Design a binder for this molecule. Structure first.
Ligand SMILES: *CC(=O)[C@H](CCCCN)NS(=O)(=O)c1ccc(C)cc1
Ligand SMILES: *CC(=O)[C@H](CCCCN)NS(=O)(=O)c1ccc(C)cc1
Length: 677
């Protein structure tokens, strides 16, 4: 039917290591966002998408309404106790934002409002609450708020005695701050007034002129993120410096005036470590002896005095730990399962938290107080909605505290499986999939295969209410736990990045091929989705295995990989050399160029595809997907659907901003469901 937009070609040569690549759409990049010929192309593509998808409006409404009708109109957090006050988060119907309340622990009846997001958002274009913490003496409330949606937080202070605000604001912060134990001094992280990278730590006396704030630390390498932490003991505020590879912690005495940063262990390439302090010891999670991490105890900083509590094991990844009165609890991964283990400080007794589900995730929830036997931990599976449990560490009594509520949901209607696929190199790849039992017939069902597979981030199998809209229409939903993710620990990550990145894409194809071969789905109705580094995955897999998929959704996709990674002017590029590599080196240029989706678009048949991007707040800049679609329109040989949807809306932190997310899901699901009919 309709003629799609055709962007002007302006051949722009890029020569590196004597290799000339001609980019015809370089100009779709406009750092200023002025150039009206760029806006015209994004606007023209949006108009083409609106018109191509106009017949799916009814379906988009059915999908939107059934996703909203699953959730409650009310939300009340599980109350927690900190420093002798109980805290709860309250979402009322009609309100755009949460209300934050508290009471003294010995009180039940009355609750005080700490902060009402709705009052805070009045006469502002944007509101997001980045952070909320009462001073140790329970008299002052620090809040980190963003009124501009650029994630530059203002810190302000409220006197709880009379509900009056202090006069100052700390501006361009990360929203990361800590109270000294005097309830009068806060440390906070300033961002670079240009790069907006967190880089300075300041000390602020509450109520005073931010002008008088003392510079405590400045990070020199902008690849080291700067964060603040406070130890369980309350003895130290921690300046946490980390790149993707490498850590360094400085100690601030939280009890005394005029503290200066005390080196813990100075940074050293490929040594990652994080600490706490409790029972007069430092506890250190460190990879110094093994990539899967160990846990050490020390009386002091010096690495030579670190005593092994838990040695690194090749088969068990150590992800994190919480400290309690009588127990260490650790978060681990073994055999493609997340697990929780508890070790008694005195007896050394070991217990495992046991589950009965093939495709679940478990994690340490919020435990702000260490003087208890009660561990709170979270559970979710592809069939069981997200649940908060409280475990008596001594007695093993497990009580449910909260279940995710899902209306119109019958859990026994659904089945899940863990499957292992032998990848082309003999490596075993775990897969989690779920489906509706009564609409299943092998070789018959559409497949939606989801992947990410970068940064060591794991697509852990959990519940999705929205996912029910595909399950109840015959779809088999697949998580492909491909290399580049963290499902099998640090080695799974490292075998999916830099000179191993191709394994990410090979794993996704191998998994899809095996699932079809073994009868999980219809070979003619295989669909895939990924966002961001998941969009890199979508982009590489359709260049390399175009026939495998009927249809693809690629969200805010990283696709112009060589060009972006050659230009430090693009925010994120300086930070990402340890993921993809540095193409200013020919080894990385050649390795990255082989799979860079924009560069490897060729004149061949592609699947149906919906591509999304944003003009404003973005990881991947809008021009990558825009250039990608323009090149695909120019070379692809098929006559299938190719749509670019650019979000022009300015950003929304209210309940309506959650309802926008449901609208996007509905448009994407209606696109795939129309293709599968
Ligand atoms: C999209 C994605 O996963 C990441 C950014 C999100 C980080 C959350 N932990 N980046 S990309 O992979 O999207 C990407 C974007 C820009 C650049 C320069 C490289 C990669
Ligand atoms: C958050 C929001 O979208 C508003 C808030 C309710 C009005 C009270 N001030 N709703 S809206 O319908 O006015 C609206 C405005 C802009 C956009 C982009 C969408 C919806």
């Amino acid at each position: 039917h309709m003629t799609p937009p055709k962007a002007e070609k302006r051949p722009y040569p890029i020569t590196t290591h004597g290799d000339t690549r001609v980019d015809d759409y370089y100009w779709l990049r406009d750092d200023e966002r002025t150039d009206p010929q760029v806006l015209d192309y994004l606007q023209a593509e949006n108009a083409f998408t609106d018109a191509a998808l106009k017949p799916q409006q009814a379906l988009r409404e059915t999908l939107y309404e059934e996703m909203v009708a699953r959730e409650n109109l009310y939300f009340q957090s599980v109350p927690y106790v900190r420093h002798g006050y109980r805290y709860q988060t309250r979402f009322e119907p009609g309100n755009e934002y949460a209300i934050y309340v508290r009471q003294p622990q010995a009180e039940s009846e009355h609750w005080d409002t700490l902060i009402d997001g709705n009052q805070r958002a009045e006469q502002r274009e944007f509101y997001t609450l980045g952070g909320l913490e009462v001073s140790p003496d329970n008299q002052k409330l620090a809040v980190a708020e963003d009124f501009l949606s650029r994630r530059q937080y203002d810190i302000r202070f409220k006197n709880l005695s009379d509900d009056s605000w202090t006069d100052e604001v700390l501006e361009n912060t990360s929203g990361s701050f800590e109270w000294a134990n005097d309830s009068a001094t806060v440390y906070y992280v300033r961002k670079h007034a240009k790069t907006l990278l967190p880089y300075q730590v300041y000390r602020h006396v509450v109520g005073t002129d931010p002008q008088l704030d003392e510079l405590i630390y400045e990070e020199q390498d902008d690849t080291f993120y700067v964060g603040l932490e406070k130890t369980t003991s309350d003895r130290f505020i921690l300046i946490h410096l980390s790149s993707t590879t490498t850590s360094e912690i400085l100690l601030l005495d939280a009890d005394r005036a005029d503290s200066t940063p005390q080196m813990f262990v100075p940074r050293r390439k490929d040594h990652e470590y994080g600490i706490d302090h409790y029972h007069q010891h430092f506890y250190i999670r460190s990879n110094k002896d093994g990539k899967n991490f160990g846990l050490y105890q020390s009386e002091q900083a010096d690495e030579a005095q670190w005593q092994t509590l838990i040695a690194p094991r090749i088969e068990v990844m150590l992800e994190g730990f919480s400290l309690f009165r009588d127990w260490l609890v650790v978060e681990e991964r073994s055999e493609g399962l997340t697990q929780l283990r508890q070790i008694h400080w005195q007896s050394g007794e070991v217990k495992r938290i046991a589950f009965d589900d093939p495709t679940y995730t478990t994690w340490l929830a919020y435990n702000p107080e260490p003087e208890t036997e009660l561990l709170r931990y979270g559970y979710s599976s592809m069939t069981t909605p997200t649940t908060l449990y409280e475990l008596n560490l001594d007695s093993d009594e497990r009580v449910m505290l909260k279940q995710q509520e899902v209306k119109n949901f019958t859990p026994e209607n659904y089945r899940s499986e863990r499957v292992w696929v032998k990848a082309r190199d003999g490596v075993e790849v775990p897969v989690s999939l779920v489906y509706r039992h009564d609409s299943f017939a092998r070789g018959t069902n559409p497949l939606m295969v989801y992947g990410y597979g970068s940064y060591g981030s794991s697509m852990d199998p959990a519940f999705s209410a929205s996912r029910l809209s595909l399950l109840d229409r015959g779809f088999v939903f697949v998580l492909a736990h491909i290399r580049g993710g963290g499902e099998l620990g640090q080695l799974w990550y490292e075998d999916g990045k830099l000179f191993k990145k191709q394994n990410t894409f090979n794993d996704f194809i191998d998994v899809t091929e095996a699932l079809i071969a073994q009868g999980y789905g219809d070979a003619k109705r295989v669909f895939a989705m990924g966002g961001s580094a998941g969009g890199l995955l979508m982009g590489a897999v359709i260049n390399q295995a175009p026939e495998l998929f009927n249809g693809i959704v690629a969200q805010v996709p990283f696709v112009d990989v060589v060009t972006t990674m050659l230009d430090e002017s693009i925010p994120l590029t300086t930070g990402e050399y340890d993921e993809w590599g540095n193409p200013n080196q020919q080894a990385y240029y050649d390795y990255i160029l082989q799979y860079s989706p924009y560069d490897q678009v060729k004149a061949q048949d592609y699947p149906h595809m919906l591509v999304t991007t944003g003009l404003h707040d973005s990881q991947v800049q809008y021009w990558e997907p825009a250039k990608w679609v323009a090149k695909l329109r120019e070379l692809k040989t098929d006559d299938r659907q190719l749509l670019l949807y650019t979000d022009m809306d300015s950003g929304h932190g209210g309940k309506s901003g959650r309802f926008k997310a449901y609208e996007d899901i509905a448009l994407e699901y209606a696109f795939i469901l129309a293709l599968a009919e």
